[PDB]
């Protein structure tokens, strides 16, 4: 069994930017979720080999995780906040697609997502 290559965290052709909102996404939003007790299943790409999930990457064709997001933000990989928010949304959605209600992983995703939504509700302006 094999994992796919992980999502890129750097791309020498992709224009780079740090906006006040992107700074907030790294320093407040990602930081708060990263430290959370439920963060660990989301801190790296799903290892379908190690977790013996041979259908994982049959079902999930746009994988995303907070490790990837963290490195993207550290590398100024994004042009804007919305790209980064989309990646978080994709991570949560994948989890809900692949798993079932009542599964701990789903309960975990939901608590992180509620916190994520709370934090992004107060994105700063480029003030």
């Amino acid at each position: 069994s094999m994992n796919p290559p992980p999502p890129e965290t750097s791309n020498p052709n992709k224009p780079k930017r740090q906006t006040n909102q992107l700074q907030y996404l790294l320093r407040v939003v990602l930081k708060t979720l990263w430290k959370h007790q439920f963060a660990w299943p989301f801190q790296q790409p799903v290892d379908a080999v190690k977790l013996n999930l041979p259908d994982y990457y049959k079902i999930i064709k746009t994988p995303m995780d907070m490790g990837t997001i963290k490195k993207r933000l550290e590398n100024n990989y994004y042009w804007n906040a919305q790209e980064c928010i989309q990646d978080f949304n994709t991570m949560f959605t994948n989890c809900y697609i692949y798993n079932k209600p009542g599964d701990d992983i789903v309960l975990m995703a939901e608590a992180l997502e509620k916190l994520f939504l709370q934090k992004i509700n107060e994105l700063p302006t480029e003030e």
């Binding site: 439920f38 977790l51 999930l53 692949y98 798993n99 079932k100 599964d103 701990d104 992983i105 309960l107």
Partner: peptide, 7 residues
Amino acid sequence: GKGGAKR
């Protein structure tokens, strides 16, 4: 799915 107990 990843049904295992995690919490």
